[PDB]
Each structure stands twice: as C-alpha cells, then as structure tokens.
Amino acid sequence: ANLLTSLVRAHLDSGPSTAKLDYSKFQELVLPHKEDAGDVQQFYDLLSGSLEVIRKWAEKIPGFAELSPADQDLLLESAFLELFILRLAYRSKPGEGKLIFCSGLVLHRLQCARGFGDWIDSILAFSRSLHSLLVDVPAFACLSALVLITDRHGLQEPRRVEELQNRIASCLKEHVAAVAGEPASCLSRLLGKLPELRTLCTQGLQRIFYLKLEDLVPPPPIIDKIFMDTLPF
Numbered sequence: 001a002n003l004l005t006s007l008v009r010a011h012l013d014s015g016p017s018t019a020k021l022d023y024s025k026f027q028e029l030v031l032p033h034k035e036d037a038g039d040v041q042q043f044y045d046l047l048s049g050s051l052e053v054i055r056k057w058a059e060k061i062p063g064f065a066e067l068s069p070a071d072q073d074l075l076l077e078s079a080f081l082e083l084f085i086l087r088l089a090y091r092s093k094p095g096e097g098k099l100i101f102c103s104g105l106v107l108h109r110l111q112c113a114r115g116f117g118d119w120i121d122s123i124l125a126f127s128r129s130l131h132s133l134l135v136d137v138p139a140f141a142c143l144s145a146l147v148l149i150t151d152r153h154g155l156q157e158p159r160r161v162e163e164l165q166n167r168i169a170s171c172l173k174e175h176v177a178a179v180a181g182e183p184a185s186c187l188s189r190l191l192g193k194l195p196e197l198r199t200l201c202t203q204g205l206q207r208i209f210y211l212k213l214e215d216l217v218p219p220p221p222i223i224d225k226i227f228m229d230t231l232p233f
Contacts (some may be wrong), residue, residue, distance in 0.1 A: 003062060003171045004138055010060035011141040014053055015091060016104035028097070028108045035114045040217040043115030046101055048220055050084045053102045061145050063164040068156050075161070077226050079148045081201040086144055089127035090135070097124070117210070119203045126193075126200055132188060136179070142172035142192060147197065205230065 010064045058064050067075070096111040099120070099136060102118065112120050135143070149165045151158060176187050208227050212219060 002156055002172075003167065004142070004175055006060070006062050007141040007145055007168070007171070008138050010057050011137065011144065013060070014057035015087070016100075020104045021106055021185055022104045023102065023106050025111075026098075026106045026108060027111060030108075030110045031054060033110070035117075035211075035214075035216065037216045039114035040211055043112075044217065044220055044223060046105075046115075047084065047223055048059070050087070050102050051080070051143065051222060054080065054083050058148055061149070063130070063167065064149065067160060071155050071157060074152055074154055075150070077152070077229050079175050080226055081204045081230075082147050082197050083144060085126070085204070086121055086130075086147060087202050088199055089123055090140055092122040092124070094126050094127040099124075117207050119200070119207050122200055122203055126196060129196075130193060133135045133177075133186075133193075135190060138175050139190060140174060142168050142175065143193075146172070147194065 058072070064072065065074075087102065088099065091102075092098055093100070098110055099107045099109060101107070109120060109124060111213060116123075146165060146169050149161060149168060151161065151165075155161055173187060173191075176190075180186055205227065208219060208223070211217075212224075212227075218224075
C-alpha cells in the first residue's frame with residue numbers, strides 16, 4: 001500500500017518521461033550495413049547509462065538501504081543485467097522494433113544489432129511476451145524489485161534479504177488480487193517471467209565474453225567487474 005506506492009514512485013522516477021524521449025538519432029533505415037568499434041562502444045555506453053539509474057532506483061526501495069552495504073553491492077551487481085533487460089523490455093515497443101533506453105534515447109533494432117548481436121532479438125521477443133501480459137505499473141514496480149532483492153551466493157544476511165522479498169511478494173500478490181476478481185495464474189504467470197529473465201542474462205554474459213575476446217573496444221571497468229564477479233568460476 002504505502003510500500004506499493006513507494007515502489008511505484010521509485011520506478012517512475014527511474015525512467016524518462018514520455019515527453020523526454022529523444023528521437024534525434026532514431027533511424028529505421030541503416031546502411032551500408034561484423035561489428036566495428038562504434039557499435040561496441042555504444043553497446044557499452046548504453047549498458048553503463050543504466051548503472052547509476054538502477055543504483056539510485058534501488059536506494060529508494062524501502063528496506064534496501066537497510067541491508068548491509070556488502071549485500072547491497074552484491075545484489076546490485078548480480079541483478080544488473082537482468083534489470084537492464086527487464087526495464088528495457090517493458091519500456092520498449094517491440095511491434096515497431098523500437099528500443100527505448102533509460103536516458104530517453106530511442107533506437108531502432110537494426111541500429112543495435114551490430115553491438116548486441118542476437119541478444120537484442122531475444123530481448124525483443126521477451127518484450128513482446130511481457131507486453132501480452134499487460135503488466136500494469138504497480139505490478140511491474142514490484143516485479144523488478146524482486147529481481148534485485150533475491151537470494152544470491154555470498155550474502156551476509158540472507159534471511160533479511162528473504163524477509164524484504166517476502167514483503168514485496170505479499171505486496172504484489174495483494175495488488176494483483178485487488179485488481180482481478182476473487183476469491184495466481186496471473187500471478188504465477190508473472191513470476192514465470194523471472195526464470196526467462198535469468199536465461200537472457202546469460203546471453204548477455206555470452207555477448208560480453210565474445211566482445212572481450214574480439215577486443216575492438218575494452219569494456220568499461222565497472223561493467224568488466226560485474227562480468228568477472230558474476231562468473232561462477
């Protein structure tokens with residue numbers, strides 16, 4: 001209720017206003033169409049732009065600043081890719097091939113293809129599927145917080161992370177009921193996305209590995225760190 005309102009405000013302050021959208025660079029027609037250095041740099045720049053945004057968004061989740069600072073960092077690092085994808089999927093318009101990034105920048109899928117590779121198509125596929133659920137903003141504000149606030153290996157206080165998650169899952173569950181008859185299949189349908197999101201996170205790690213191999217442009221340090229810390233080996 002007040003948790004819910006707090007989650008909604010954090011979500012909406014973390015993205016651009018429909019009026020701050022920038023189509024300055026949008027172009028559906030590319031030419032004369034393997035990645036080069038400018039595609040690799042833009043890929044890392046787009047990823048980097050979500051960094052601060054997602055960190056400031058997390059600090060506004062009630063309870064999150066009360067986790068230990070080491071657990072805060074671990075949760076943020078481990079969830080970054082997944083959050084970047086989920087928020088991009090929800091914000092974008094896959095029917096038109098339109099990617100909308102957290103800064104307001106709008107790009108066509110073909111303008112991203114070279115930097116992202118196949119991953120961008122799998123992100124758009126997930127976006128169309130997310131869209132069919134017609135997830136409203138409150139449900140989505142809870143969902144994304146649950147992507148962040150979740151069990152990870154190396155937490156100092158995993159029970160406290162679990163209680164905050166229970167707190168947010170109750171809030172979501174209630175909200176879904178308040179909006180759809182009485183006295184799950186919506187709910188469990190929404191939660192069913194979380195496993196698909198983990199799989200796209202992996203495609204992202206694969207893409208970064210590949211770009212790191214090819215080495216046209218090195219990843220910026222913070223991205224690199226996320227990449228190395230999240231490798232279970």
